[PDB]
Amino acid sequence: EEHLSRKVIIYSPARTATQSGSGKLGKWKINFVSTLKWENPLMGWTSTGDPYANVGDSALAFDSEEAAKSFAERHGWDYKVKKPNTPLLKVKSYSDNFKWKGNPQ
Amino acid sequence: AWRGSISKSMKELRILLCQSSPASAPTRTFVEKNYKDLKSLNPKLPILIRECSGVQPQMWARYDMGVERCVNLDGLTEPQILKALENLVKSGA
Amino acid sequence: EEREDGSR
Amino acid sequence: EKTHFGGLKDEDRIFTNLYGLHDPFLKGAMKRGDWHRTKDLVLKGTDWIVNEMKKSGLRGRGGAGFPSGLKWSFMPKVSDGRPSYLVVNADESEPGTCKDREIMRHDPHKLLEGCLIAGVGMRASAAYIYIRGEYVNERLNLEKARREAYAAGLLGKNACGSGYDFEVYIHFGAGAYICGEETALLESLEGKQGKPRLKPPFPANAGLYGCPTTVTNVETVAVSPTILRRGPEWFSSFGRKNNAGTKLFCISGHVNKPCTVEEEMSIPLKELIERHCGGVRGGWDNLLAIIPGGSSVPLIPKNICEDVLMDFDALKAVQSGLGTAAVIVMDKSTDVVDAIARLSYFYKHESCGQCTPCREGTGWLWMIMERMKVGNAKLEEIDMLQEVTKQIEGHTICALGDAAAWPVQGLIRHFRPELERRIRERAERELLQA
Amino acid sequence: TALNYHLDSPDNKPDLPWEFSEANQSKVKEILSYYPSNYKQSAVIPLLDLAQQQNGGWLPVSAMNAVAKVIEVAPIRVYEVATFYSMFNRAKVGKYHLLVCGTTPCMIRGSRDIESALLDHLGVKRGEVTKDGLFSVGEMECMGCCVNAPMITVADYSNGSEGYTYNYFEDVTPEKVVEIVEKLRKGEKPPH
Amino acid sequence: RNPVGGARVHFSNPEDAIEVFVDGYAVKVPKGFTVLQACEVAGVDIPRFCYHSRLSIAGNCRMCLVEVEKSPKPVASCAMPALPGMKIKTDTPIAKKAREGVMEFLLMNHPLDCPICDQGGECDLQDQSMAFGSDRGRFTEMKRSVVDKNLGPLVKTVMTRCIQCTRCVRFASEVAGVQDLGILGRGSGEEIGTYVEKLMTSELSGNVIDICPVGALTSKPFAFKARNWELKATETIDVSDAVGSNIRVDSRGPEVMRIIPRLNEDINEEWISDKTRFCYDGLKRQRLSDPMIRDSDGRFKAVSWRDALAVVGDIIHQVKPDEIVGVAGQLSDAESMMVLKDFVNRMGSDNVWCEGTAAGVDADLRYSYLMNTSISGLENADLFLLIGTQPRVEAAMVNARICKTVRASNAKVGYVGPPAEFNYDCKHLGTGPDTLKEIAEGRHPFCTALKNAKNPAIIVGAGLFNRTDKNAILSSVESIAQANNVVRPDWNGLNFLLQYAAQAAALDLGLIQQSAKALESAKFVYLMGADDVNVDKIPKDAFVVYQGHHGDKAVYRANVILPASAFTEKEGTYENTEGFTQQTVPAVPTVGDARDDWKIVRALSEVSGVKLPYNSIEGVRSRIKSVAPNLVHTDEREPAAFGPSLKPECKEAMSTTPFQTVVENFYMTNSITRASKIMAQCSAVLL
Amino acid sequence: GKTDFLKNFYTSNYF
Amino acid sequence: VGNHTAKWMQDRSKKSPMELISEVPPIKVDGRIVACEGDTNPALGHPIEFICLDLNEPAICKYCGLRYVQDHH
Ligand SMILES: Cc1cc2nc3c(=O)[nH]c(=O)nc-3n(C[C@H](O)[C@H](O)[C@H](O)COP(=O)(O)O)c2cc1C
Ligand code: SF4
Ligand code: SF4
Ligand code: SF4
Ligand code: FES
Ligand code: FES
Ligand SMILES: [Zn+2]
C-alpha cells in the first residue's frame, strides 16, 4: 500500500573499471533508491528504517529487461528504464605500433 | 509595423518544433523565413527556437508577471503561423 | 585507514 | 664429394683473408678479387640475383638456416611509397663465436660488396650495419673501409657506375645479447630498448621504421658476391643436398689447438676436430660432451658425436642445431652441471624481461641449477625442472626462451645419473654428519 | 651498485648545465645525418656513447637530458635506453675503466684469478674510483671464445671523445695486470 | 551467441567480413579483428593482463594464449589477426597447460600481501588463479623485492605487486599525453618508474589505478578504507565540468567512499579526470546543514525552515520587481533552474541567469552554444582550430578525445589564445582577435591548411562569451567557418565549449541576463548555489539569500542560508556541452536539514504568495516540456535543425584585448572541490 | 491554509 | 598521540602501538634483501614478506612494522 507507490529504476549494472573480466553483466536489477540512513549515537553504526534497504541488490534479480518491467508493473511501482552502455569493438592491429611516419616534412 | 514592436509586448517568445516530422515542416519554414527579420527588428527579444524529436509544433509567448499563452501550430500553413504570431503580439500583450 | 607512519 | 665431406681446398675458400696475413683495405681487397665487375652483377637485375641465390642453396648463417633466396624474394617487387631497407646483423654476442668479427676485421670489403648486392637483390635503397657495441676497433676498421668504398664510387649515388643508388650506414649497440634477435635489433636501431616484436607483422612487410626490411647475418651477406661470380652450381657442389656451401667454423674448449676455419658443410664433427684442431685434448676417448654451434643449442653426448655431420639437418635430427657453428668441446674433467648452471645464469642475465615466461622462468631455472650443482635438491626436482623448461618453451615472444630451456633439457636427457648421484652423495653426507 | 632510479647529488643533478662541446657538434651532426630527420631517436645510442666519452666515461642525468633534447624525445625514453644497456655507466668511473671477472667461457680456464689482485694493488673495492680519480674496476662483459687468455678490458676516457679507446688484453696475469696499470698511470698505452 | 559484455560490432560493408571458428562455433567478424576479439564476439572470455582495448597491443603477459589449428606454438590471441577458416581452440589441454604455466610464473615473485592489498576482492590475478591455474605452488626459493616509488599524493605505490604488464606506461604515452612513466632496466629486475624523482602531473593520472590489474598502483586517499564487497555502487554522472562524464559512486552507509569511471563510448570512454575522481572528500566537509538567519550581532543562528522562509518571503515583498535578482549556480540541475526562473518571473523580474562567462549570450539557436560535432565526432576531424579555450583544464575528457584524434589520425591543431601547456603538438597562431582577423583574411600556412582540410573543426570557448566585443568575435568566427565550408549537411565542424555542468540546461531554459548591471542595483539577491559570482558588486544594503551545500564568500555576505542537497544525494537533470541530456541517481542521504533545490524554491514561492502549478518533480519536468522539451527527452542524440544563416549580420568593431584564461586552477573550480583536502594538496604539489 | 507540499517540506526531504 | 590512534585509544597511560614500534631500532642485515615472518616460528607470525634494502631510509615490513637496514652499504 504505502510502499507499493514508490518510484524505482530498472537498469543493468555496468562492468567495473578495476577488472577486465566481463562475467557479471546481463543481469537486470530494480533500484529502490533507498537513501535514508543515519548514524546510531552509541557505536556509530549505520541505521535505517526503510524495509527495501538491500533487497534490490541482495535478493531481487531479473535475467531480462522484460521480466523486471513485468514484475514492477504487476506490483504497481512507477519505474524508469536506463539502457546500459555497451562497448564498440573496433579494428585493432599490432602492426599499428610500427606505422611508418612518412617522408620528413 | 507590429513586427517591429514585439519586444514592447512580450518578454520572451518560444517556438518548439520537430526537426524531421512533416507536421513541423510549416513551422520550420516559418523559422527559416522569418527569424532573420524578427531578430533584426527585435535585437533584445529572446526568441528561443527549441527542437525536439517528438514534440508537436508549438509556440509560446511569456508576458509580465510570468503569464504565458500557447498556440498549437499543427495543421497550419506558414502565413497562418505569422497571423498567430501577430495575434500573440497584439492581444493579451 | 592509513596510519601516520603509513601502516595499514 | 657426395660420399664424404671435408678437406676444403684453398681454391674453394671464400674468405681468403680470414687469417689476416694481407691488407684488408681497398687495394688488397681488389687484389684478392673484391669489387670485381660489380656493375655487371647489379645490371643483371634483382630477379637474376634472387634466382642465383635460390639456386646456390645458401641458408641463413645467423643460426636459423632459412633459405636466403626465398627470404630475399619476400621483399616487395613494387614500392608502395615506403622505402626498402637491408639490415646486416653484426651483433654476435653469443658466447664462443667470433666469425663475424673475423669477417669485419679482415674482409670488410666483402661485407660492403655483399651489402650492395643484397640491396640490389632486395630492391633496397639503404643498408644499416648493426655492429656489437664492444667491436669498437672492428667498427672503426669497417668505417674506414666504408669511406674507402665511398671515395672510389663503389657505394652511394651511382654505385659502381651501375645507375643504382645505395647508401650504407654503420650503427652499433650498447652491450645487449637480445639485440642480436632481428626484431629486437630493429627496435634498437629505432632508438628504443632491445625488446623483440611479436610476429606478425613480419619484417618484410613492416620492419625498420615500419618499412619492408630484411635482417640477415654478416656471413650470409659477405658470401653473396663470390657465389654470384663463381656460380651457384659451384657453391651447391659442397655439402649434402639442402645443406650446400661452405661454412665458417670455430672450435674452442678442450681441444689441442683451437682455431677458426672455413670448412665444407656437412663435415663430420669428429673429422673436423681431429683434422683442424689436433683432436680432443687427451684423446677422443677423453671426450664427454660437445656443444655443436653456440650456447643456444643442446649439447650432444660422446656417442652421438662419433658420426654426426655438421649441417642443419644432421644436428637437427639429434635434438641439436648448427647455430653459429661455434664448437665448444668438453672433456671428462668438466663439471657439466656447473657449465649448464653457468649457461642458465647467462640466459637469466641476458633476458630482456618483456614476456613473463622468459623473465621469470630464466631466473627460476638458474636458481634450480645452482641448487643442483651441489646436490642441494630432491630427486623429484629434476622432473620439476623439466616441466619448468616445458612451460617456458613455446610460450615466449622470441626464441631466447627456447635457447634458455634447451641446455637444461639436454642435461636432463643425457646426464640425469650425474645429477642423481650428486643428490644421493649430498644426502649421504647429510645423514652421517648430523 | 647499479640502480634503476636516480637520487640527486652535487655532481649528478638535473640543474647542472650540460651540452655537447663545440668540437663534438660536428660529430653530433654527422651522427644525425645517418637517419631520416623525423627518425632522430635512432641516434640515442651513438649520442649517449659520445656524451659518455665527453663526460669522462659516465653519464650524469644532465647528459641524458641533453641527448633527449637533441633527438626531441621525452627524457624517460633516454633513461630507458641508458638503463637497458650495460655499456652505459651511470656512476663515476676513473679515467681508465678496467673491466674484469668475465663470464662462462673464460672461467673454465680460470678467469677469477685477476680481479682480487687488481683491487689489492689499486687499494679499492669494485665499483669505487681511486682517490686520484684514475682507475675504477667494473664488470667485464665477454665476446669470443676465451681460448688463449683470461682477459680484461680497458676503456680509456682520459682524453675525452678524441682519445677514447676500448681494447681487450690477452694472457693477463696478476703480474701483467699490475704492469698494465703502471703503464696506464705513466701514460704509455699498454700493448695488446 | 551474445558478444562478451554485449559488445557491439559495426560492419562497414558485409563484403568486408571473414569467417572464423571459436571452439567449433561459427562466428563472423570484420576484417582486421584479432583472435581475442573474435573470441569475444563468440562469447568466450579469454583471460588477459597486458591487453587493454583502449591501448596499443603489447602481447607480453602471455596469459591469452590459445590453440590455433596448424599452428606449432600457442598463439597470443590479443595480437594475432584473425584469418578466414581459422580454427581457434580455447579449452584444449595445450591452452589450459599454457595458462597454468603462465599463472605459475606470474605468482612466482608476487608478494603474499592479499590481506593488506587494496586490490583484494576485485583482483584479476586472484580470480584467474582460482579459475585457470588451480595449481598448488611449488616455488620455494627467495622472492625478489622492489622499493616503492613516490608518484604524488594521488597514486599510492607498492611495486612488489607489479607484473610488468606495461599498461600504465602505454596509458601515459598514448592517452594522458604525458610521458613520465617508463620501464627501466632489463630482465627480472626491470622496474616501472620515472627514474628521476617526479610526480604524475597529468589531469588523467588517476586512471592508472583503474588500469593496473594488481595493487601496484592504488588510490592514496582511498588506501585501506574499504573492501569492494561492502561498497554500494550507484551509476550517475559527474558535475565537475560540462562534459557529463559517466561515473560509478561507491558508498558505505551515508558516506561516499570513492568514484571510478563508468563506460560511455560517446563521452569519456571509461576514463575520468582527477578532479572527478578525487573531489568526493569535500562532500562531507563544510556542509551547510541548517537554515540560518544572521542575528542582531551579525552572527548566523540556526532556525527552522518555516522561520527562514517566512523571513525571506516577508522581505521579498518590500522591494521593487526590477530589484529582484536570481543567480543559478554552476552545479544546479534543470528542475531547480526552471523553478527559480518561474519564481522570479512571477514576482515581476527578468533578472535570472546562470553564473559564469556565458551569462548573457544569445541563446536563440541551440547550435550557438553547443559542441555540434559531438565528442565522438571529433575523431573524424583532420584539423582543429581552438579559439580562446584551454580544453585541458576546461573539459579534460574533450581534450583527451582531441589528443587521441591527433595521435591516431595525425590531425593538426591551431591555437589562438593565451600561452598554455598542451599534451599534444600544436601551432600557437596568436593570442587575440587580431589573429582571427588574419585567419579571416587568409595569407597564412594555417589558412591554407584549414582550406585543405576535409573535415575541419573549430572549437570556441565559452570564456569569450563575456567579452565586450563578443558579437564581433562570433561574427568573425562564423565568417571563417563559412569561408572554409566548415558547416555542411554531412559535417558540422562548428563548436562551442561550455565550462559548467548547468550552463547547457540554463541556456536551453532561457536563463539569460538581460540587464548587464542588474546585480549592482539589486536589493534582493537569490544565490542558488552561485558561489562563483563576485559578491562585492552586490550593494551593501541588499538582502542576500544563499542556497547551497557549500560556500565561502557568498555565505559570508548572505543574510539567510538555506541548506541544499548535493548532486550525489538527488535526482537532477544535467545537459553537457554537446547537448546530451542525462540524469543523476541518488547514492547517499542528505546531511542535516538539507532539502532539494527545486523543493526550496517552490516552498519559498508558496510562502511568498506565488502559486506555481506543480507540486512534484514530475510536474516540474512537465513544465520544462513547455520550455526546453529536449531536457526531458533524456539520453537521446539529436542533430541541429538550424544554423548560422539565420543569425542577423553584425557590424561591431573588433577589440584588441587578448583572450584571457578561464580556469586558473583546475582543482579549484567549484565549491565541492574547494572543500576537499585532496584537491588542496593537488593544488599545492601537482600544479 | 497550506498545501500538502509545504507540510511535507517542513517534515523532511523524503516525500 | 596522532589522529589515527585517538579514534580508538582513550587511555594515555601506555604508549600507543605506533610509538612502541617506532622505538624498535632497525635490524641490520648483511645483504640487499631480507624476509620477515613476524615471529621466530613462521606459522605463528604473518605471511612471509620479502623486503628490499636498496634505499638509505630504513625499510618497513608492511605486516608487523619491523624495520631493516643494510649493515654495510
Ligand atoms: C636471442 C637471439 C640472439 C640472436 N643473435 C643473433 C646474432 O648475434 N647474429 C645473427 O646473425 N642472428 C642472431 N639471431 C637470429 C636473428 O633473429 C635472425 O634469425 C638472423 O639475423 C637472420 O639472419 P640469416 O637469415 O642470415 O641467418 C639471434 C636470435 C635470437 C633469438
Ligand atoms: S623470450 Fe625473453 S628475451 Fe625474448 S622477448 Fe620474452 S623476455 Fe624478452
Ligand atoms: S594484487 Fe593484491 S589481491 Fe591481487 S594477488 Fe596480488 S596481493 Fe593478492
Ligand atoms: S604498475 Fe600495474 S599497470 Fe604498471 S606495469 Fe606494473 S602491473 Fe602493469
Ligand atoms: S674472462 Fe673470458 S670473456 Fe672475460
Ligand atoms: S593479453 Fe595477450 S599476451 Fe597479454
Ligand atoms: Zn614482519
Q: Structural domain boundaries of chain D?
A: 26-240, 336-434
Task: Determine contact: D355 vs chain F, CB below 8 A.
Answer: yes
Annotated ligand binding at F354? The verdict is: no
Identity of the amino acid at H59? A
**Which region, left, alpha or beta, applies to residue F75 given φ > 0 means left and ψ of -120 to 50 means alpha?**
beta
Q: Which atom of ligand 3 is nearest to the CA of F124?
A: 4
Q: How far apart are CA D310 and CA D262, in angstroms?
A: 12
Quick check: helix, strand or coil at residue D113?
helix
Dmax (CA) for chain E in angstroms is: 53
Task: Extract the C-alpha cell encoding F303.
Answer: 532556525
* Domain membership of residue E56 as a residue range: 18-92
What cell does F551 get? Answer: 560556500
Phi, psi of E128 (to 5 degrees): -110, 140
Q: How far apart are CA F343 and CA D82, in angstroms?
A: 68
The alpha carbon of residue F635 and the mean position of all alpha carbons in its chain are separated, in whole angstroms, by 16
Atom 4 of ligand 3: nearest residue by CA position: F123
Contact partners, residue D270, CB within 8 Å, separation at least 6: D284, D305, D306, D307
F117 is in an annotated binding site: yes
- Comparing CA positions, the residue from A41, A52, A47, A69 lying closest to residue A2 is A52
Q: Where would I find the H helices in chain E? A: 22-32, 44-54, 61-71, 75-84, 104-107, 115-122, 174-186
D64 labeled binding residue = yes
B6 vs chain F: nearest CA distance in angstroms? 15
CA distance D56 to D245: 8
Q: Which helix (H) or strand (E) holds H10?
A: none
Q: F212: closest CA among F163, F250, F152, F282? A: F163
Integer angstrom CA distances of residue F338 from D48, F1, F505, F609, F620: 83, 47, 9, 18, 8
Residue corresponding to grid cell 605468482: F107
The maximal CA–CA distance of chain C, rounded, in angstroms, is 11
Alpha-helical segments (H) within F30-179:
35-41, 93-108, 124-131, 167-171
Cα(D360) to centroid(ligand 3), Å: 18
- Judge contact between F187 and D352, C-beta under 8 A: yes
Residue in F with minimal Cα distance to B34: F646
- What is the three-state SS of D241-262? CCCCCEEEEEEEECECCCEEEE
H/E segment holding residue B62: strand B58-62
Chains touching chain H at 3 or more Cβ pairs under 8 angstroms?
Answer: C, F
Contact yes or no for F597/F564 (Cβ under 8 A) = yes
Which residues of D fall within a CB distance of 8 Å from A95? 200-201, 205-206
Locate the DSSP E strands across F504-592: 524-528, 543-548, 560-563, 573-575, 581-583
- In whole angstroms, give the CA distance from residue F21 to residue F87: 5
List Cα–Cα distances, D221 to D108, E93, H69, in angstroms.
Answer: 11, 39, 55
Distance CA D360, CA F102 (A): 10
Pairing of strands F573-575, F412-416: unpaired
The CATH architecture to which H16-70 belongs is Sandwich (2.60)
Tell me how far CA of residue F276 lies from CA of D254, F401, F611, F635, in angstroms. 70, 17, 38, 21
List phi, psi (to 5°) of E36.
Answer: -50, 140
Q: How would you label F85-108 residue by residue, b for 16+ Cβ within 10 Å and e otherwise?
A: ebebbbeeebbebbbebbbbbbbb
Domain count across chain A = 1
D89 alpha carbon – ligand 1 mean position (Å): 7
Length of chain F: 687
Which cell is B71 given?
A: 498556440
Shared-domain flag, residues E135 and E168: yes
Atom of ligand 3 lying closest to residue F110 CA? 6
Distance between Cα F76 and ligand 2 center (Å): 14
Residues facing residue F67 across a β-bridge? F89
Which letter, b or e, does each residue of E110-124 get, where b requires 16 or more Cβ atoms within 10 Å of its Cβ?
Answer: ebeebbeebeeebeb
Query: Nine-digit cell at D2?
Result: 657426395
**Count of helices and strands (H, E) across chain H:** 2, 5
Q: Which domain holds residue A96?
A: 1-105
Residue E101 is assigned to a structural domain of this protein: yes
- Do residues E68 and E151 share a domain? no
Chain-chain contact of F606 with G6 (C-beta, under 8 angstroms) = yes
Residue E6 belongs to some domain of the structure: no
Unique residue bearing C-alpha cell 569561408: F483
Rounded to 5 degrees, φ, ψ at F595 are -135, 160
Q: State the angle between helix axes of B78-90 and B25-41 in degrees (0 to 180), rounded to the nearest 10.
A: 50
Which residues, in sequence order, are CB contacts of F81 under 8 Å at separation 6+?
A93, A94, D200, F32, F33, F34, F35
Distance CA D14, CA D117 (A): 16
List C-alpha distances in Å: D289 to D103, F23, F260: 29, 46, 61
Q: Are E143 and E169 within one domain?
A: yes
Task: Determine the distance separating the centroid of ligand 6 and the alpha carbon of F158, expressed in angstroms.
Answer: 23
Ligand 2 contact, D353 CB (< 6 A): yes
Phi, psi (degrees; rounded to nearest 5) at B7: -60, -40
Distance CA F115, CA F121 (A): 10
Cβ-count burial F623-633 (b if 16+ within 10 Å, e if not)? bbbbbbbbbbe
- Cell 561550455 sits on residue: F498
C-alpha cell at B13: 517568445
Q: How far apart are CA F651 and CA F607, in angstroms?
A: 48
The last residue of a domain, from among E76, E92, E108: E92
Amino acid letter for position F669: T
According to DSSP, residue B7 is labeled: H
Cβ(F113) – ligand 3 distance below 6 Å: yes
**Is residue E13 in some structural domain?**
no
Task: Output DSSP code: residue E173.
Answer: -
Instruction: Give me the domains of chain F, ranges plus CATH numbers.
Output: 4-108 (3.10.20.740), 111-230 (3.30.70.20), 292-363+503-631 (3.40.50.740)
> By what technique were these coordinates determined?
cryo-EM
On the CB side of F621, CA atoms within 13 Å amount to: 14
**Partners of residue A102 in chain E, C-beta under 8 Å:** 38
- Give contacts of F79 with chain A, Cβ < 8 Å: 94
CA dihedral H31, H36, H42, H43 (to 10 degrees): -150
E189-to-D133, E161, E165, F342 alpha-carbon distances in Å: 22, 16, 10, 95
Q: Give chain F positions within 8 Å (CB) of E77.
A: 179, 182
Ordered by start, the domain boundaries in chain B are: 1-93
Pocket mutation for ligand 4, best pick of F52, F163, F184, F200 (most atoms within 8 Å of C-beta): F163
Contacting residues for F590 by C-beta, under 8 A, at least 6 apart: F565, F566, F569, F570, G13
CB-based contact, F224 to chain C, within 8 Å: yes
Say yes or no: E122 and E186 in one domain.
Answer: yes
